[PDB]
Ligand binder design. Structure first.
Ligand SMILES: [Zn+2]
Ligand SMILES: [Zn+2]
Lengths: 97, 42, 105, 165, 68, 179, 541
């Protein structure tokens, strides 16, 4: 529903409609929402005992606590969203080196 | 079995008393007890 | 939920020593064991409150609560005395548990 | 509601605690059945306790086992090493008044087996420095001549800490 | 190090507008925007030369090797 | 699936990581055929049919009797009798203890009769107590587990994770045409 | 240079001789660059001039020694026994709280971070290095063989690591590199002092858990071996020992294992008669027994709380301990050569012969920094690439190197674990700045508001817990761990106070009045059924 409300004669929608670089996933991840940063197939594990970050309660399997960002790159990430994106980025960054 | 000595708190075994009767008696202390045992567990 | 056990079980060891101190008070040839803290101020005592808690206000007035201990004395515990390597082993004999005195801050 | 006054009540002797590890408690009717026969010994400078328990010659004695391998034995030796502590006190109350007694040492009795040493010492033929933890194990069984008269009495002790106040 | 003579993009001489800028900062106390506006330049190019410039030579001349 | 699986084939290793065997069925019956064809496969079901393992001593001999019910066998299909469990105990290991004697009584108890450094009877009882609840009963020994799976159509296909492919292909219920 | 530099000479303060028993040198005082009532080393070489002259930047170590003769005369004399390299901007350099005119007079930039050595003209940096937690328990698992437990000993003279492997059937037997073909743990903790079989069963299994039938195999092999305490039991552990020590070899009947179960081997516990060590190995059993029944209760090596950061102060202390142990050995063997050959007793030259033996405590102390090989003979942790040359690409390059933490790998074949970003370094380590290449994830950086702590005393914290209500371990039954959480002081068990929430609350309230609060911390743990107090620093906060 972001690609349909997106006006024509812009750069990334043309670059996704034509070839070289950019898809609908990249423009939906810039504009609308980034979603579900996964590592090693599943979601992020418990970095501490019974939880991932110390900013969430114990036995909290909510999406905002266990690796689901909800802000797009235009709006800005929260620090748990920033750490969750940094883990999934450094996973793919170390598999190249 | 898992039975313990009331006198020295050690592990008792099953031995043959003079070739033909069974009794539980440790080598830990002078103790013997001629009962039959049960080893039921779920 | 851990604060509930810090107030419910405190109404159990205070009543357990109340069942031990005055109920068996007449004349048992019998000893107990208290855990007093070190660096003692150089006395005051139990001061059973309004059927609530038991809190010692010791002399040298700075104040020192504490009752109750653990069930480590399931085994047999008997005290005894000694002299200068000539006569010993004069037992009194029982323990009926222990109490622990912990200074509040 | 009043209180029950505590006193330090004087300090002139040394106390000790058995704290047995073998016979916890019976099911009822005045439990823990402490024996009478023992009459054991004592050793200082390593603190090396020994205490004894009599055996049952009537039941479960196993007369073949108790006299076949090792010698005809009736003693059952226990062993414990005490360690110094702080803040522990003993208590005895007479109807209004709690008495603190410095007790100063706590040990635990553990049944060390001596007849296996007696059996292995027979079946064999049938240097000034140690620097800690070996000098204590070397100097352990030297004097031992405190074979002691196991006595009782609550009259020489209860009328011993009440006179000063 | 020192203020450049010409700006990089168009080439207007901005080296004549540094001491007169520091004179407007200390005395006749103004903000940087208005005191840099009534000094010449209207475009944001050649305004960036005087705004974002660090003066390293005042710290470099404390290490003079020809004197003591 | 990735680059440690192409190397799994190019090296041609003797043991591999996570094998599967895709077998098919004959009829179109989901529950009953699913349970019986799955039940003809896995092993060491003795920790689900016994409820206890006890060892008593009767004055010269020992009973290691096991209480095998009939309710577990009624739910999931295992075509066996107590004689089949006696044959399974008869070949419980290769050569450890299981040579001399077993017994079969009315209400399904099998007590291993035993006969004699010193006093090895209690040691044999403890080792045979601790080696009994993983003895296989009925099924194939070299298959871990089995999952029956549904395709896009109304067909059911089982799959195991073993190493046989001969005793799996020689199994009543499945067809040996393709696997 | 203020605390540990005095502590080193208090362990080797006196030397002997084989010539006569009436010969001793006594170290009284030590300090760096201070002689008399004048200022602290009135003129050094400046730190800029020694970078152009290809020199080192060092201050001399002044020791004070006692000097005797057979005429029983006793006096003192201050001597210079070698140079020690001074780090920039820390209490001995000229650049300590200097004025901005003082920085320009001495030809130094006032904005460099400092903290780097300038050896042989060039700028070297000792990197911060992470390792696992010393004197603490870690448990790892495996699918193929079984679960393995480790415990790294932090003793000074030797490098021990007491492993607790299993192979099959729950046949638990610990291993060591100084022991032969190993023994199950029933005999081992039977030799330590736990003699009853009733309390070898309750201590590691509980009342009605499923832990009992798992551990009861090791009781069954109790009678398979040297059972029936130490007329057979400790002798079997003493018989299978390595490092035979043929000097006084006749001890191996009763006393070769009392060497092994004490401060020589396996741990850092200094007990004479063993109650804590008999429990610490026995509490090490329960954490494996709980991990056999539940494989989830295992520790991860990559967790940031399981690691310690070793700084530039510990490595220099190790190097100075080694070069001071070597200093007395090369001087004792060179003073007995002269004090034997003539007939008379030599008055002088026993103090005036130290300057030819003080050139290896200087050249080695600079060589191990300039080269990077911290080769110690007794310690056996030979690591290369420790010191690195200070990067001067820009201003942010020389600052981002002083923040850098370099980790060590075991092997570079199947690592796969310590390169991902752990969630436990939130605010502790930098989550962005990592190198791109071979050292991707192996090299990390500190954040802004962090602090790496130090070990303070360890003595008054243990005496403060006993005031707050915990009993000593020699006063509690062996069948009492169904109680509340058991207190651990740096891994060592203290005695399991009741009501641990009030204990944690009062300990944190005492921390907020002054207990000086760099590292002395407390935290509960439910799956371990314990509550930890940490005092031994070397750890971020
Ligand atoms: Zn016994
Ligand atoms: Zn321009």
């Amino acid at each position: 529903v972001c690609i349909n409300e997106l006006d024509n004669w812009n750069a990334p929608l043309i670059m996704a409609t034509c070839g070289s670089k950019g898809s609908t996933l990249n423009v939906s991840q810039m504009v609308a929402v980034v979603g579900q940063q996964i590592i090693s197939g599943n979601r992020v594990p418990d970095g501490f005992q019974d939880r991932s970050l110390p900013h969430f309660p114990k036995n909290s399997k909510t999406p905002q606590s266990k690796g689901f960002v909800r802000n797009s790159f235009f709006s800005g990430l929260s620090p748990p969203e920033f750490l969750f994106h940094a883990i999934s980025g450094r996973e793919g960054l170390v598999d190249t080196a | 079995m898992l039975s313990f000595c009331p006198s020295c708190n050690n592990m008792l075994l099953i031995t043959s008393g003079d070739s033909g009767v069974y009794t539980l008696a440790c080598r830990s202390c002078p103790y013997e007890f001629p009962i039959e045992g049960i080893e039921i567990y779920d | 939920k851990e604060a509930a056990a810090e107030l419910e079980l405190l109404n159990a060891d205070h009543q357990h020593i109340l069942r031990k101190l005055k109920k068996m008070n007449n004349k048992p040839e019998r000893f107990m064991v208290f855990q007093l803290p070190t660096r003692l101020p150089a006395v005051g005592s139990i001061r059973v409150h309004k059927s609530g808690k038991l809190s010692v206000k010791i002399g040298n007035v700075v104040m020192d609560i504490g009752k109750g201990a653990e069930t480590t004395f399931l085994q047999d515990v008997i005290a005894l005395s000694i002299a200068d390597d000539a006569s010993s082993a004069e037992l009194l004999g029982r323990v009926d548990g222990k109490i622990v005195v912990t200074p509040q801050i | 509601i009043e209180e029950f006054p505590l006193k330090i009540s004087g300090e002139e002797e040394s106390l000790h605690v058995f704290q047995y590890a073998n016979r916890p408690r019976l099911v009822g009717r005045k439990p823990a059945e402490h024996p009478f026969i023992s009459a054991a010994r004592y050793k200082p400078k390593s603190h090396l306790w020994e205490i004894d328990i009599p055996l049952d010659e009537q039941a479960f004695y196993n007369k073949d086992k108790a006299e076949s391998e090792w010698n005809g034995v009736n003693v059952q030796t226990l062993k414990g090493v005490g360690v110094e502590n702080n803040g522990q006190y003993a208590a005895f109350v007479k109807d209004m008044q709690v008495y603190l007694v410095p007790i100063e040492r706590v040990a635990q009795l553990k049944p060390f087996f001596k007849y296996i040493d007696d059996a292995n010492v027979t079946r064999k033929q049938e240097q000034n420095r140690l620097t800690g933890s070996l000098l204590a194990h070397k100097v352990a069984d030297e004097e031992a001549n405190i074979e002691l008269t196991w006595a009782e009495g609550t009259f020489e002790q209860f009328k011993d800490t009440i006179v000063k106040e | 190090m020192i203020v450049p003579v010409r700006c990089f993009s168009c080439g207007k001489v901005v080296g004549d507008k540094w001491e007169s800028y520091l004179n407007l900062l200390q005395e006749d106390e103004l903000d940087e925007g208005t005191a840099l506006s009534r000094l010449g330049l209207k475009r944001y190019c050649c305004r960036r030369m005087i705004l974002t410039h660090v003066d390293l030579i005042e710290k470099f001349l404390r290490y003079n090797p020809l004197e003591k | 699936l990735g680059v440690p699986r192409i190397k799994e084939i190019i090296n041609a290793s003797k043991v591999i990581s996570t094998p599967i065997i895709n077998a098919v069925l004959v009829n179109d019956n989901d529950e009953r055929a699913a349970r019986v064809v799955k039940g003809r496969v896995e092993k060491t079901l003795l920790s689900d049919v016994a409820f206890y393992v006890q060892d008593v001593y009767k004055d010269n001999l020992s009973f290691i009797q096991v209480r095998i019910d009939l309710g577990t066998i009624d739910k999931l299909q295992l075509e066996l009798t107590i004689e089949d469990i006696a044959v399974a105990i008869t070949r419980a290991s290769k050569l450890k203890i299981q040579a001399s004697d077993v017994n079969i009584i009315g209400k399904d108890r099998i007590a291993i009769n035993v006969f004699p450094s010193e006093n090895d009877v209690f040691y044999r009882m403890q080792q045979l107590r601790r080696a009994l609840p993983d003895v296989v009963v009925k099924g194939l020994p070299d298959i871990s587990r089995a999952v029956i799976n549904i395709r896009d159509d109304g067909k059911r296909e089982l799959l195991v994770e073993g190493y046989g492919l001969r005793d799996v292909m020689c199994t009543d219920g499945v067809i040996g045409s393709r696997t | 240079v203020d605390t540990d530099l005095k502590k080193i000479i208090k362990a080797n303060q006196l030397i002997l001789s084989d010539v006569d028993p009436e010969f001793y040198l006594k170290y009284v005082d030590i300090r760096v660059g201070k002689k008399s009532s004048s200022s602290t080393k009135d003129y050094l070489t400046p730190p800029h001039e020694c970078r152009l002259r290809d020199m080192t930047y060092s201050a001399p170590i002044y020791v004070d020694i006692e000097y005797t003769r057979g005429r029983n005369i006793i006096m003192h004399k201050d001597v210079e026994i070698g140079r020690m390299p001074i780090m920039l901007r820390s209490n001995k350099c000229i650049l300590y709280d200097a004025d901005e005119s003082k920085m320009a007079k001495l030809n130094e930039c006032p904005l460099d971070p400092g903290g780097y050595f300038i050896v042989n003209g060039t700028e070297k940096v000792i990197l911060v290095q992470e390792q696992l937690s010393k004197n603490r328990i870690i448990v790892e698992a495996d699918e193929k063989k079984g679960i393995v437990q480790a415990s790294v000993t932090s003793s000074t003279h030797e490098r021990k690591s007491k492993t607790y492997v299993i192979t099959k059937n729950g046949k638990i037997y610990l291993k060591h590199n100084s022991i032969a073909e190993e023994i199950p743990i029933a005999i081992v903790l039977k030799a330590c002092g736990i003699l009853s079989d009733l309390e070898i069963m309750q201590l590691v299994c509980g009342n009605d858990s499923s832990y009992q039938d798992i551990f009861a195999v090791n009781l069954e092999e109790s009678s398979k071996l040297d059972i029936y305490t130490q007329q057979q039991a400790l002798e079997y552990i003493g018989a299978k020992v390595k490092t035979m020590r043929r000097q006084k070899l006749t001890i191996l009947q009763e006393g070769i294992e009392a060497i092994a179960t004490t401060v020589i081997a396996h741990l850092t516990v200094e007990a004479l008669d063993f109650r804590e060590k008999a429990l610490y190995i026995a509490m090490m059993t329960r954490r494996v027994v709980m991990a056999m029944y539940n494989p989830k209760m295992i520790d991860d090596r990559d967790y940031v709380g399981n690691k310690r950061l070793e700084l530039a102060g510990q490595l220099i202390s190790l190097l100075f301990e080694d070069l001071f142990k070597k200093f007395n050995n090369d001087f004792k063997l060179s003073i007995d050569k002269v004090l034997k050959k003539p007939n008379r007793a030599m008055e002088y030259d026993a103090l005036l012969s130290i300057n030819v033996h003080s050139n290896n405590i200087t050249s080695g102390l600079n060589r191990a920094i300039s080269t990077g090989n911290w080769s110690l003979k007794r310690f056996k942790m030979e690591r290369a690439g420790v010191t690195h040359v200070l990067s001067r690409l820009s201003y942010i390059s020389a600052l981002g190197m002083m923040t850098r933490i370099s980790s060590q790998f075991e092997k570079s074949r199947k690592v796969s674990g310590p390169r991902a970003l752990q969630p436990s370094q939130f605010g502790m380590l930098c989550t962005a700045d990592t190198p791109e290449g071979e050292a991707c994830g192996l090299v990390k950086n500190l954040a802004l508001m962090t602090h790496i702590t130090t070990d303070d005393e360890e003595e008054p914290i243990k005496k403060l817990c006993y005031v707050l209500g915990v009993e000593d371990i020699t006063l509690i039954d062996s069948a009492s761990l169904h109680l509340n959480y058991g207190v651990y002081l740096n891994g060592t068990l203290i005695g399991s106070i009741r009501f641990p929430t009030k204990f944690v609350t009062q300990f944190r309230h005492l921390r907020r009045t002054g207990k000086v609060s760099e590292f002395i911390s407390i935290y509960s743990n439910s799956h371990q059924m314990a509550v930890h107090i940490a005092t031994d620093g070397g750890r971020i906060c």
